[PDB]
Amino acid sequence: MAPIDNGKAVFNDARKFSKFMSIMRMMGNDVTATDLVTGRKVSNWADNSSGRFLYTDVKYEGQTAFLVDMDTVKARDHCWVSIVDPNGTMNLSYKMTNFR
Amino acid sequence: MSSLLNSLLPEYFKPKTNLNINSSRVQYGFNARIDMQYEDDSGTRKGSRPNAFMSNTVAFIGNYEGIIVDDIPILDGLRADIFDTHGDLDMGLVEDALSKSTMIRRNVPTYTAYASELLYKRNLTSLFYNMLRLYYIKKWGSIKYEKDAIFYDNGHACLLNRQLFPKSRDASLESSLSLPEAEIAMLDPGLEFPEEDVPAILWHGRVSSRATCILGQACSEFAPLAPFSIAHYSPQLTRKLFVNAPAGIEPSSGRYTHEDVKDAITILVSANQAYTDFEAAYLMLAQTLVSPVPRTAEASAWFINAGMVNMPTLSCANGYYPALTNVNPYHRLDTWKDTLNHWVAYPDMLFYHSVAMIESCYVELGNVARVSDSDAINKYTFTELSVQGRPVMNRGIIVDLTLVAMRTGREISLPYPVSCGLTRTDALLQGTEIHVPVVVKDIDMPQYYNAIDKDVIEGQETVIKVKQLPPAMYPIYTYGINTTEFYSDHFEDQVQVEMAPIDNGKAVFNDARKFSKFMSIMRMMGNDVTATDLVTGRKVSNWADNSSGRFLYTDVKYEGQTAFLVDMDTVKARDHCWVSIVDPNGTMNLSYKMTNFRAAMFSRNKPLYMTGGSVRTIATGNYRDAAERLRAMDETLRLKPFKITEKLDFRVAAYAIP
Amino acid sequence: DLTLVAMRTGREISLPYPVSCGLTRTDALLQGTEIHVPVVVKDIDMPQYYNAIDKDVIEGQETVIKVKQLPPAMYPIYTYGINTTEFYSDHFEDQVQVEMAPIDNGKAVFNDARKFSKFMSIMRMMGNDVTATDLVTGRKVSNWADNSSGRFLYTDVKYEGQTAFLVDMDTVKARDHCWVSIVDPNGTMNLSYKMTNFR
Amino acid sequence: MSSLLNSLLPEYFKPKTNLNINSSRVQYGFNARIDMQYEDDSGTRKGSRPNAFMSNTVAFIGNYEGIIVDDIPILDGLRADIFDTHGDLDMGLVEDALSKSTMIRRNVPTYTAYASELLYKRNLTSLFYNMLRLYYIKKWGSIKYEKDAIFYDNGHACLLNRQLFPKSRDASLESSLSLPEAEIAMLDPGLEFPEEDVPAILWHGRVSSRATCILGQACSEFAPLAPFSIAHYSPQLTRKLFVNAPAGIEPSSGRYTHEDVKDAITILVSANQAYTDFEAAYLMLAQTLVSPVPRTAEASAWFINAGMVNMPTLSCANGYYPALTNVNPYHRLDTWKDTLNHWVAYPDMLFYHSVAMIESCYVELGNVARVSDSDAINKYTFTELSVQGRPVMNRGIIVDLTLVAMRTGREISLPYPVSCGLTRTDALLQGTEIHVPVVVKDIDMPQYYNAIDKDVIEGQETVIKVKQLPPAMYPIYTYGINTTEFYSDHFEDQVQVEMAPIDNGKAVFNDARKFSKFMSIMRMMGNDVTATDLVTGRKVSNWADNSSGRFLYTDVKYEGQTAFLVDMDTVKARDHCWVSIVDPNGTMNLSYKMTNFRAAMFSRNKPLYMTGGSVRTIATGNYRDAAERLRAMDETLRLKPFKITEKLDFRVAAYAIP
């Protein structure tokens, strides 16, 4: 987790940003970040049907740095696992069973 | 002492750097998961509590008073050559040290005579204490104290801030104090006779316009309006304060930021080599900073009488004789600069260390209060048996660090036997019932609380009687590090009790231990049971404290022997898991497991989130380039722990040597 | 002054008498406060680069710059590559690898602070005027911030924060003589130099 | 001698440097745990006092009068060359030494002739004694003396300060003395013939402005208003005092602090090489610093007439012969500098050394007064047999040191047989009746005390006839180290009083020894017993003291035949923490046990705490090992480097040791 200065966490790397928003989606937290180069808002809740986050939802080929809004983290779908305030190194281990 | 108080925090919790406190009240706890399993003669039942919040409440309100007393000198920072082969200050070598470091040798006989009288009273702990308090007044200077607010509120009784704190008005923390300024004069080199009862301190370069105003206000009298923990009444330290600065000091500005106070402390320590003096002041503030909000109405008896804060007398002779302080300082421990290096990096970490300390003290005093006054280790003679040094008096920090040793069960050690800070054991050491003033909210108040007036009306101000002091706080951070039968703060436990025969709709519990186990089970299942004490004729309830979800035997509010008549027909269903049953039959077995701990803090009925980055560890090893451990274990303070040995009575606690 | 020389060369300095006389340099450092240096402006677009007190200043006005952290006053020249540190980067041989894909239209973001310093420095040896812009704060830095040494130290940013430097590689201008040209790059870039003899 | 007075202090006593005295009365003692037991045919009754305070009251008042006597010369200090094999001034080597020096050639023959008389004038004890008194007058200057104050009070008889000390005005210690200054002239090196009956001293460099004022007042008449112990009457030591200082004597300042007197002493001892002279002055002041408040009303006979202090005449001829004093002096004992080095380090330790000496003396004079004249070692001839030296006259320090030798039971050794200081054994050797004045409180006084009148109305000034001197102090510091059966200062003790049921409580003690132990142990148990003598018809009460809480046999105030009727149905419970004797039948068995000891001091009915550093046992070796060490680290400024180390961030720098 990046240091939360005021109420904003800067994610300079591309891979780490993809893993962060992928975790927060599985927990069920609608996080909204601002792309600094373009100046357009990205959201992990882009597709409702398939419950996963792809990096192409940013809608900008090339290199950039994201400013994540940690104060406005809405609670759409909450299991007992779901937390709002991450601290340090985040570990999420999930298992999928009972397909029908 | 950072490394000591840092150890008290639980292994799972590692707090972040910053914490934006915006209120006079903070809840702290954890969200655990409980997996209960019930078995009796009727059959078996299995349940699971998915989210359970166990928390205490701590506030920034506490009536304290300062007294100036004479304490031991801290001989750390002085050059290593003046000390002989042993750890003793020889005046034979002070004459030599001052002689070799000057051209004008006429002044050596005069210099030696004055130095011998002043070196045995050097202590900067009181100056750093006030400088630290000024830092936190400016930082958290938007906390409001309202006079007609609530202090404790259960439903039957209520305590307002008008009571417990008379002679108070409504004010913010910045608006509480209007500090005057003491004269910061310049010491011209050439003055031959040191003026008596005025300390002189060294400084790096020019004294800044802002640094003058801080030193001026730090020495002045503190006279508060609102009762605040970090703005308590303190006497005037000094009238004058000389500063041996090569470049002349600037006049006082009047205004300063909280950032400017950090720059003032960092320079003052580095120049004077007063690192151990800062460590004393750091521990001394950890006691005062926060005060507990009482668990029950009876636990307000602790905070009626104003506790005395023993501030050492301010004396220093570095400004007059700068030859004695050189590049090779004398220190007992090699980890003697850790506490300052910790504070300057992470200032807001002191909040967590303070909560950890005051919890450990007020938890263990819960046991010491229940000890009978006819044993080897009792309330009078527990400190004297524990300490293995030679302090001036068993007061202040020595009392508090003795209770931390008894809690954790480890040997705590300081380099100097300092006796400075708050003494808590004042309400305890007196054979008198304490008169807590309370307000009546419901008409049926006299049935529950031991009130003076047996007939009351909603709005009346009455008084309740407290004979034995109940526990003010429940273990939260120190949960399961060592488990006593009284608190019963286990991770895994199998409680077994035999149900009494239900005659009409009432079950008589003659024994004291069996009654404690019964109501402890029914609470974990979530059944609000109400029993009648037969001797007194007053109603007890297991749902006394809502915050911490456990039952202590002190909720009965009657020291001595009795028999309870439990009402089995009027067993209400407040919180029901699948485990929860109403009709027990035969021998009751409850086996629970606690897993998935995660710390959470609440402030003003919303979640308080930690900001900033992750705290990286700063810590120095036992050796830098030192060959032989010259033990020097004669002057050093050592505090030995005591283990609680459970016995048949259950109402009485007893201590033994491990 | 002698203990600072001992740290630089990495040897043991011995004097016969422990005499304590002369100039004391470490004065502004130990204070640990803001210093207000006066300046007279030339251009009108000054306060974007320098941490100035005013945001709009007409030419020929006397302004003030707020300096918090003290930048190095001299670059190592006589003590060049005898006790080398990665801050100054005073090596004989050095190289940097900036990784770009053709999908990116010249625009590269330096997540790392260390290789950003080496890129901006070697580009100045090659006689190229690069102007990076910080994405978080919104300030600008120029590699041409000296007319003596001809190197870029990281303290020329005049701000300690998070590292996200956007450099647009179609606004690179050839300034000096005896220079290599970057007309239109595509793929991974590899810069390198070698200093052989000294006079 | 610091060494021998240090050994007198108890083992449990751990003294600190500073002692903040703010009154003219101190109750030094210890807290002990007494486990009392009363066994009888009916059953056993157990008691336990956890904090029992046994005290001896010590004041700063006492009438003394100085007289100038002729004493032996102290030859320690002069160069070792002029001395022969036997250890006396071989004149012929003196003439050789003066010839081969920096002296004026025309003065050699005339100065050598005078040497025979002047070189045997070496005694600076009188000067050091007065300069030590000036140190303590300015330090503890704020202590007060009221005229109409209570010197002693036991309920029945009262003794005021007006009674013992007439011609006495109430004033503070600082405002008591108004010392006029003696002339301090500069010695002309080119003087024709030395002026005998005018002492000349040496000095290092320049005599400071304050040193003139101190030496001026030290060599002057002490004419006090209030009867203080450290400001007693002393005659004029000398009219004029020469000082051989090539650097001119500055004129008198007028004012000086207590630190400036330490500066004056350290220069005087070092220049003159007079350490044995200081050791004599230290032991002199140890006797006459504090006087004991009498234990009983009839124990005031010791302090009626003023005891004479023997001050040896001020005589020094070092100023006339500078060549004979150098860096290689002649000394008898190797540990000859230990007494000065101890005082310079710990000045306030003299208070503890003083009480240790007077408590040792007045205890032994208690059990010396109770021996018949027809014996080998008796009242008159106890000093002669003990002394194995050649003093001028058995007075002053010889009589006090021989009493300490009897108490501790060890061999006391001094380098020179000096006979100077206070003589205590004055009222004893007279062997006559002493008439102490008393003001009565009750009307039934003259049954208890041997009064002059048989009927006396309250508020009348009467006289008590004291024949045998009772003990003035009870042993406290010397408790159970050399135990006697008179004081009965055992840890464990028991008494068996044999009674039959036919006797209706009334017991007759034929034995005197077990009567004393019965009456004493009953007072520990807090019972007011009143026995009546059958032969004479007088009465005795065990409650005859409010400090120690013991009954000595000298409280009967009569030597005759022993037939004490005690009625055991008139026993009254007086104190708290007491065992009750409701109705005894058969044989009684009383017993007690003292287990642990903790040092305690009281002043103005409040606890007086010791502050400052930890006092050590300074040895001659502990300083001269640092002289053997010399700090042999070649004084060469070797600066070691630090290699910078780069890590992940690179923004911040990190230095390593190698």
Residue numbers in the entry:
A (entry chain AP): 499 to 598
B (entry chain CO), D (entry chain CP): 1 to 658
C (entry chain AB): 400 to 598
What did the paper state?
L-BC virus persists in the budding yeast Saccharomyces cerevisiae, whereas other viruses from the family Totiviridae infect a diverse group of organisms including protists, fungi, arthropods, and vertebrates. The capsid of L-BC is organized with icosahedral symmetry with two subunits of capsid protein, named A and B, forming the icosahedral asymmetric unit. Decamers of capsid proteins are stabilized by domain swapping of the C-termini of subunits located around icosahedral fivefold axes.
The existence of the open particles together with domain swapping within a decamer provides evidence that Totiviridae capsids assemble from the decamers of capsid proteins.
